[PDB]
Amino acid sequence: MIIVYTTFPDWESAEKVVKTLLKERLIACANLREHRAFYWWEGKIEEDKEVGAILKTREDLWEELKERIKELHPYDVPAIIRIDVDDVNEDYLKWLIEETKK
Amino acid sequence: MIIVYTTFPDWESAEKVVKTLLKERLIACANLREHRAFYWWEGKIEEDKEVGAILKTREDLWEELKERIKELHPYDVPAIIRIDVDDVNEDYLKWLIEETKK
Amino acid sequence: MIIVYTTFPDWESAEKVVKTLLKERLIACANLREHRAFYWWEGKIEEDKEVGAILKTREDLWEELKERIKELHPYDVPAIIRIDVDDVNEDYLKWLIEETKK
Ligand SMILES: [Cl-]
Ligand SMILES: [Cl-]
Ligand SMILES: [Cl-]
Ligand SMILES: [Cl-]
Ligand code: NA
């Protein structure tokens, strides 16, 4: 399986996007939590509150998930970071595989 | 070393489990913070407040740690995710090894 | 690209360090959020509020970044954890590499 990390400007957009992803079953679940971001943007260091999202899904769904997030994301250049899971308990992996599209 | 990510339904269970893992020297430490979870569960997209836990330990302790968490976890199907650390400062690694059993 | 995870004792140090790393373009950005750390100290399990920081940068900047964090960090034995990113949207990766030193 894989973990996908992305960030949103607010709770409204984060919740809307994540719910759509769940409805389309591109992910089995998401963990949302606030954070403060500091980043470079056109010659200036920006500071913004964001809602970070940890999405969990199947490895084979990466491409489709990434594309969908791109179409739904409020940011023009969002962060869609994929981290492969080296191992996970099989009983959980089963639930995840079962709850994701196939 | 490795990082292990798991979630709990509340702070009570999260603390109990983490402290048990520490007393048994299966992990060097943990980072816990709340998050809003959205997931599929028997035909419904559940929304709940959870406590996410980031555990740090040695690679050779993974299996034993995974099985121990399965026994202690309040969730019937908990997420026990392993992510290998590609590199880390040496002093921290040495500290982590000294803190974990064997 | 890679993600580097470290923790700080407070927001003052977290933001000062992160802003310095950005100014020197060792990272493209960072996400900071509080958490509760659990670890052994003085013979017992201690709980401490910390500010976790997720930094995003290029793989080739790892060594320089790690050494810089060591020089700036308030902790004597800080956690400087590198986790390689398996995949990421390429428009974000293009942005990230163009904002970091070289
Ligand atoms: Cl998978
Ligand atoms: Cl996190
Ligand atoms: Cl080192
Ligand atoms: Cl892309
Ligand atoms: Na990896």
Side-chain angles (χ1 to χ4, degrees):
Chain A
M1 64 170 282
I2 63 174
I3 291 296
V4 173
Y5 183 66
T6 184
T7 70
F8 298 85
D10 52 41
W11 283 97
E12 172 172 45
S13 61
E15 291 183 52
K16 181 181 179 60
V17 172
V18 169
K19 290 179 184 176
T20 293
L21 295 178
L22 282 164
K23 293 181 179 301
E24 310 186 334
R25 290 187 180 281
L26 287 168
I27 62 176
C29 86
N31 293 173
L32 282 57
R33 61 114 185 74
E34 283 179 335
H35 69 60
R36 287 188 177 275
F38 301 79
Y39 58 102
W40 273 111
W41 193 253
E42 305 190 70
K44 56 192 165 57
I45 292 176
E46 292 299 314
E47 190 177 301
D48 280 301
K49 291 197 304 298
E50 297 186 304
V51 175
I54 294 175
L55 316 176
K56 312 183 192 187
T57 194
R58 304 204 311 269
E59 185 162 51
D60 61 284
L61 287 166
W62 165 241
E63 287 82 4
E64 186 173 357
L65 170 60
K66 185 209 315 161
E67 289 302 306
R68 191 66 179 128
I69 294 175
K70 271 176 164 290
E71 307 177 309
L72 299 169
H73 213 296
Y75 285 158
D76 288 308
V77 182
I80 309 176
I81 300 168
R82 167 187 171 178
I83 300 176
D84 287 21
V85 173
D86 297 287
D87 198 17
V88 59
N89 47 312
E90 311 272 34
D91 56 308
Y92 175 91
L93 177 59
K94 184 284 290 190
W95 164 82
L96 179 147
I97 292 177
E98 184 180 307
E99 296 303 316
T100 48
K101 68 183 301 181
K102 61 189 67 64
Chain B
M1 69 177 272
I2 62 175
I3 280 183
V4 180
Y5 183 65
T6 185
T7 70
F8 300 88
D10 50 62
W11 283 96
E12 185 64 63
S13 58
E15 288 189 53
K16 188 174 302 179
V17 176
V18 168
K19 292 192 173 188
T20 296
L21 298 177
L22 276 167
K23 296 191 299 182
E24 296 180 2
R25 297 282 184 177
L26 290 171
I27 63 173
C29 69
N31 290 179
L32 285 56
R33 85 285 180 281
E34 297 185 2
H35 67 241
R36 186 96 65 66
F38 299 76
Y39 58 105
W40 280 106
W41 190 243
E42 310 196 308
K44 176 178 176 58
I45 298 179
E46 301 293 3
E47 188 184 317
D48 193 3
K49 310 70 183 179
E50 301 185 306
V51 177
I54 296 168
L55 318 181
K56 283 91 83 179
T57 189
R58 305 201 309 267
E59 290 167 44
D60 63 293
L61 287 173
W62 169 236
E63 294 303 328
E64 183 173 3
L65 173 60
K66 179 188 62 181
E67 295 303 323
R68 189 53 177 143
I69 290 174
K70 294 187 69 174
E71 309 185 311
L72 297 167
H73 215 108
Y75 280 146
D76 296 314
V77 182
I80 308 176
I81 296 161
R82 164 182 169 165
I83 296 178
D84 293 8
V85 176
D86 297 278
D87 203 4
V88 61
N89 51 312
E90 191 164 62
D91 50 309
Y92 184 89
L93 179 59
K94 294 186 182 303
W95 168 84
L96 178 146
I97 294 178
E98 178 205 65
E99 292 296 67
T100 44
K101 72 176 189 176
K102 299 179 178 181
Chain C
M1 70 171 281
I2 62 172
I3 282 183
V4 171
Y5 182 70
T6 188
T7 73
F8 298 88
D10 47 55
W11 283 93
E12 185 181 312
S13 62
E15 299 200 353
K16 282 189 179 176
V17 172
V18 169
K19 288 178 186 176
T20 296
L21 297 177
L22 282 163
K23 181 186 183 67
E24 299 175 0
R25 287 180 183 282
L26 280 169
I27 61 173
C29 82
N31 296 172
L32 283 51
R33 87 284 181 283
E34 296 189 4
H35 68 235
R36 274 207 205 170
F38 290 73
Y39 58 98
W40 290 98
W41 188 273
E42 290 185 54
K44 66 165 57 60
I45 295 176
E46 183 173 303
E47 298 177 53
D48 281 295
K49 175 207 71 289
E50 296 190 306
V51 174
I54 294 178
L55 316 178
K56 317 176 207 192
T57 192
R58 303 205 310 275
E59 290 166 40
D60 62 301
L61 292 179
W62 167 239
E63 290 300 321
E64 179 176 3
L65 173 57
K66 172 165 57 63
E67 295 301 331
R68 190 60 176 132
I69 292 173
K70 288 178 184 179
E71 308 177 319
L72 298 168
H73 211 112
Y75 285 150
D76 295 311
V77 183
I80 311 175
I81 298 172
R82 169 182 174 169
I83 293 175
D84 283 29
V85 171
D86 297 285
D87 208 351
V88 52
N89 50 312
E90 313 189 320
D91 50 317
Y92 176 89
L93 187 51
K94 181 60 180 181
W95 163 78
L96 179 147
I97 66 170
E98 300 295 339
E99 295 301 328
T100 42
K101 65 187 296 292
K102 190 179 180 183

